[PDB]
């Protein structure tokens, strides 16, 4: 299942070292995790909570925060951000 990220998601992935325009979903998830981790967007106490309100991630998800445990929600964000 190869995917092609829209401009905003692509900007996010490239910001963490991704140098391609076509991805497998696992690669997309890998680099999104790298982005969240490197920018420390997760809550330090309940580390499945991710705050994205004042970050490009917030524009992608269209929400202020989400839980890493909500897999369907995360997949839905990627899918809506694909061409």
């Amino acid at each position: 299942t190869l995917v092609r990220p829209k401009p905003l998601l692509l900007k996010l992935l490239k910001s963490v070292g991704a140098q391609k325009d076509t991805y497998t979903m696992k690669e997309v998830l890998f680099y999104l995790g790298q982005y969240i981790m490197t920018k420390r967007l997760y809550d330090e106490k309940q580390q499945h909570i991710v705050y994205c309100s004042n970050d490009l991630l917030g524009d992608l998800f269209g929400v202020p925060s989400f839980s890493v445990k909500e897999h369907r929600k995360i997949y839905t964000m990627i899918y809506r951000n694909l061409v």
């Binding site: 998830l29 890998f30 995790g33 969240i36 997760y42 580390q47 499945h48 890493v68």
Partner: peptide, 12 residues
Amino acid sequence: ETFEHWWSQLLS
């Protein structure tokens, strides 16, 4: 659990 722990599950 740590952020990496939760996230790694999405790669499982």
